[PDB]
């Protein structure tokens, strides 16, 4: 839904979970579960292996999602030095630097955090 998300093509997905080595036919419970695939690198994971909530699972499938290592800030479009401190939205899993949010954040939020895209919807 963001301009660069609609614009940028997506990598060929690798049909194996990077965490359990399972497939869409077998997760860690040996049950079927569709994979989520990174649009940048193509690596995949089961939502259960990613420890996603049901909301994250249903929302990221429709978005140009990036894995933990590919994730770039949705404002400044960079990974940055403090990439470890990039926040992940608890609704859409997009990443934001604290300084790149609106309003900018100086202290790490407690509890659930919803990004500026998801708060009005």
């Amino acid at each position: 839904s963001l301009p660069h998300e609609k614009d940028k093509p997506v990598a060929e997905p690798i049909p194996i979970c990077s965490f359990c080595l399972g497939t869409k036919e077998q997760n860690r419970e040996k049950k079927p579960e569709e994979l989520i695939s990174c649009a940048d690198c193509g690596n995949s994971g089961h939502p259960s292996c990613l420890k996603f909530s049901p909301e994250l699972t249903v929302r990221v499938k429709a978005l140009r999602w990036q894995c933990i290592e590919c994730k770039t800030c949705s404002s400044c479009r960079d990974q940055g030095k403090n990439a470890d401190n990039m926040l992940f939205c608890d609704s859409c899993d997009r990443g934001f630097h604290m300084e790149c949010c609106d309003p900018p954040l100086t202290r790490m939020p407690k509890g659930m955090w919803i990004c500026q895209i998801c708060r009005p919807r």
Binding site: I16, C20, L21, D84, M112
Partner: peptide
């Protein structure tokens, strides 16, 4: 809130890359 760091820790880390490639083949 979650960060790239907490997310990394939460998953427990990737399986070995070589083992992933053996399965893909």
């Amino acid at each position: 809130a979650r960060t790239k760091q907490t997310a990394r820790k939460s998953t427990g880390g990737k399986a070995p890359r070589k083992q992933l490639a053996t399965k893909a083949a």
